[PDB]
Design a protein around this ligand. Sequence first.
Ligand SMILES: CCCNc1cc(-c2ccc3c(ccn3CCCN(C)C)c2)nc(S(C)(=O)=O)n1
Length: 108
Amino acid sequence: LTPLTEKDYEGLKRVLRSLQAHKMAWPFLEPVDPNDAPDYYGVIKEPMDLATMEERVQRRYYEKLTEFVADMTKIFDNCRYYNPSDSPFYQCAEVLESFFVQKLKGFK
Ligand SMILES: CCCNc1cc(-c2ccc3c(ccn3CCCN(C)C)c2)nc(S(C)(=O)=O)n1
């Protein structure tokens, strides 16, 4: 979709910080440590996390909003694939994705 402006990027920074501050974002703040998730990097071919997204935002990696949404969705999709639906980690993805949607709709 449409090219991101500098003003758009300030809004993306705001959304990212909101996610990083959320009480249920802690499993997603940094790349998964293999010691905390057996076989994680054998299961998940395209890992993603909020620190990697922050680095990409600061580097102006994103050209369009779809690319930012895609990386954010990877975080949630990876979590729900790796973990069972009754896992607390799965629930964190449920809560934080709903929050992301609220914030993304606000973003314009
Ligand atoms: C047994 C299957 C568990 N599945 C998991 C586990 C984790 C996870 C666990 C601990 C964690 C973080 C983040 C910090 N800590 C604590 C510190 C740990 N060390 C010292 C760095 C994530 N994240 C997911 S995830 C990303 O939601 O898919 N799934």
